[PDB]
């Protein structure tokens, strides 16, 4: 963009919550497909569905974790990781069945002497392995 | 018996059913070869008593 835009700088809003950035590398929507609720061709329970909205259609920071370089890597499950996070969470046990999409913003800055590179990932059922 | 369906005591919301009852029809629940009997023959040697 001649008058200023760039894919490196974005503004996020979603209910009270706005994130913003300078330094992205875009953003990217998981096999292309953007959130969204249930249709009625493809619907199976019959009662009304409960629709937080902007309650629970926010923005949720989990607790900062911090890297060195012994750091071998994180993981997080959803909709687990959110299970404690006001009215999502809420929501959430008061109810047999639930459907999320999620917009997943990983934050780490650092500065022009460092370097390193971290491997983001959203894998659907990430089952792993266990101790035995 | 009371003909009721769920938005009858319940707030539903929409929904296109796809199910059918196709398997549980009268010929599709009978629709299966089932063993009546175990018949028991030989080729023995006919012999006075036996």
Redesign the interface.
Known sequence: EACGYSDRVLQLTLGNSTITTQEAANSVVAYGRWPEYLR??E??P????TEPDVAACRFYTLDTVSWTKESRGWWWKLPDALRDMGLFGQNMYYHYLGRSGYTVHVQCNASKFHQGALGVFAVPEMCLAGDS | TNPLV?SDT???????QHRSRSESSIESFFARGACVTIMTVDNSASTTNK
């Open positions: 009625d061709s619907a199976n019959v009662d009304q569905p | 769920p319940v707030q539903t919301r929409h929904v296109v």
